[PDB]
Symmetry: D2
Subunit: 272 residues, 4 copies
């Protein structure tokens, strides 16, 4: 893997060859990028590099977009699952004019069948938009594999609000595990909230060496918290420990992933 800064110090031909496979069988995207020295000089993050290449694709003609879709490679099933795949996969290409495209890196066989089963029912117009979204996702994940992002500045924060009592939840224990990829899976940290309901010690994860792409899981110990306030709960509490499973897709970004909670309800969302 190479850093963004080192990659962009290379000669134009070398950069075009390095990035040539980001959009597979569409090396012309990378060629177009290096042709614009003005924009090449403004790129500093992997997010800006992806956005530049995405912009080239999105501003191209309909024919060139269609050619890009068709250039994309065609995608442990049981005998009947494989037969059904086959039929739907064929029906899709025939009616859309371009292949069924799906970002499968973090998917399973159930994901694929469900995607094909649903999207074969859509108009070619909706699917053209969906297919383009998929190729940009695939390109993003290929870019991440080739670029060293250890220097990224993204970070993960958390907030807990007690919606039963109307206050930040203070002194609540919070654990964080990394679930995937298998290389660095395991405990990331054990934290506690301050009087503002934020993690004591600041962000749970920060920077490209620990705020990395993958799947994570909070454990909020809400049962302990409510007991400390004497809040009424069932003897077998409706909510005790709350797992919150989420993915991080971009090492440049600030993810704020909070919890709103009462003894009888909770909610969370992708914040910033």
């Amino acid at each position: 893997p190479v850093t963004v800064k080192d990659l962009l110090s290379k000669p134009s031909a070398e950069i075009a060859s390095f990035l040539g496979g980001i959009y597979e069988h569409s090396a012309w995207v990378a060629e177009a990028l290096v042709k614009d020295a003005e924009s090449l000089a403004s790129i500093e993050t992997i997010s800006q590099l992806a956005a530049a290449m995405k912009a080239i694709v999105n501003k191209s003609s309909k024919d060139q977009k269609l050619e890009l879709l068709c250039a994309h490679p065609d995608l442990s099933l049981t005998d009947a699952e494989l037969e059904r795949f086959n039929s739907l996969n064929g029906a899709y290409r025939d009616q859309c004019g371009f292949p069924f495209i799906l970002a499968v890196r973090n998917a399973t066989k159930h994901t694929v069948l469900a995607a094909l089963g649903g999207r074969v029912q859509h108009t070619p117009e909706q699917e053209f938009m969906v297919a383009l979204e998929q190729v940009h996702k695939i390109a993003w994940m290929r870019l991440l594999s080739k670029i060293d992002t250890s220097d990224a500045q993204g970070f993960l924060t958390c907030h807990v609000l007690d919606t039963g009592n109307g206050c930040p939840a203070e002194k609540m224990r919070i654990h964080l595990h990394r679930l995937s990829p298998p290389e660095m899976a395991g405990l990331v940290g054990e934290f506690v909230t301050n009087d503002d309901g934020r993690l004591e010690g600041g962000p749970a994860l920060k920077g490209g060496k620990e705020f990395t792409v993958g799947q994570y899981e909070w454990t909020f110990f809400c049962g302990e918290y409510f007991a400390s306030k004497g809040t009424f709960t069932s003897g077998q509490p409706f909510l005790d420990t709350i797992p919150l499973r989420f993915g991080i897709d971009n090492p440049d970004d600030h993810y704020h992933v909070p919890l709103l909670v009462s003894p009888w309800s909770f909610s969370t969302y992708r914040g910033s």
Copy 2:
């Protein structure tokens, strides 16, 4: 001993069987069986618990205080933790006039310390109300352990709503595990949502043989569902597989524990 079978026994037998539900307080049970026709209309363990609780709650302040003082006082604790515990417990008892009471099943030291550490900060009249709540919770636990509830008729239902698109989420795969108690932990079902976003085949669990007090976990495979719609999600999806951990406290009750979900948010609540 089932509720129907118990309440058919001679009243002195009944008062003896229930005389320890509230510690050293056989007078509650005596008051209960004294009205043979109000007794006759008690049909479920919930109504039995409510009847005894009503006897306690209508008693005098002095009666209630003696009941608290009759309840018995409270492993892995470090020596520092043990000293803090003893210090807090002594402080509690001397400012309140009754012992520290906590209704929890298979508690952790973290729970006890947090509860004690927080509630020793409350006024004696708040703790009076909290202590009584705990004693009723303990009454419920004791009733559940002495009564055969296999004939209970509660049940568990689920609903999934796609808040991104404003429709029920159809054909979503859902698994259910029982986490506790250990003896019957394991996979208890694999489900799929119907056209209305409800479980195909009705309740996930029904009646006292399988809808039993304990801790459970839903697994919602939302990633498959979003992909079926071509809904935009990140390459590493923010949400795809969603765990929902919850407790069941009463085998008589209908528990409705739904999921409200978008690719970027989710919530739940204890419904009925």
Copy 3:
């Protein structure tokens, strides 16, 4: 206006004449519809009629769809607003090859300028999907204007859950007003919740004569409810009376518009 049943019993040529203007200058859609006599005999509601015409457009070729879009007419303003409109509107056409189309619910100039300001920045392929969506919305509204839906079977229900205490909210007062269209605007009813947190006496609105398309507003008297339970609230409560403003778009459908509420939070959603 004519009912669906009475429309679809007329000769095929009268039907096509009747529906020739649903899609602007696209009489071929309706004429396509009537060639399917078996398909025609299946349609029972206005929802099913709309879906049938929608399906015909969705199965047509790209150039047909494009010509349908182009057949659509071009779309309070200040000097600066009008010149912004003209510039963006012109730019949009040159970019996409079809005019800017917006399903104006007699909406405001603010909606129009906002839509154009946002959508002029999209790719033509996303905009083609969006334009098609707008055309179908416009068709649906034209269909509602031509069809007598007085015998529609849709209805409105409500449910209130107290997430602060984990129970349905009983005996909460709830008012409902119609805001638009202005001819039928005003109070439609005053209600109270029952034991299950649902409206006493059933649905607030039922059938095509009272459950009609327009804007409505619930008024939930939550302050009164929390006071009745002695639930802690601020002297000036954070939540007292809660307005919930919502639109009904389809007289056939069941709208369930619930409230999840604590003294410190609330949520609602489009249920079915």
Copy 4:
């Protein structure tokens, strides 16, 4: 008189000023002014209220019950039937509790009073003892607010809008804010737009004791325009377009954060900080 002004006065003058905050309970103000350096650290009306509340809370049960009984019995537009039901409930309540029915509500309707009495008469005396004490503290807070000039308070109101359908801040959404009560200060108090962060352009909607004042407010979120700017699918008659958000501000010292979580098909809010 500001808090700064008040607490810089001789202790006898402070005690006289605050002697009626709790009904017939001058002892509260007495205990307050005699800890002269705990007193000295009090900088805001919030802290002043907290200090007096603490004195009450640490008092004996006998002192607390006497404080409750010192409170006036609240026995308008009631019908004859409603008036009889009121007297009946209010009589029952005091009979079973040993102290009068106490309710701290700003401009309470008869519906509020009857609903409160109707519900709380079904509670145990020990639950109601807690509820009553919460009510007297709320009344103390109301009296402090009316006697003290809070124009120098430094609380403020912020807003954030999150698009939960797309997982992004909602940029360029128009947002209006009205004050609904008290009627003397009612009216439009601002028109705003969200920035790229989904927060109000120009910062807090209200700031400081002259505009961030106790009362009832209403946001108006123009979500229909926002969804249209994204090309997000909405119904011809949109389920959600213009969203009112009615809420109360109780403490001019505090930071109130009252955000909107929204999709075309759902929305939620909460009391943030």
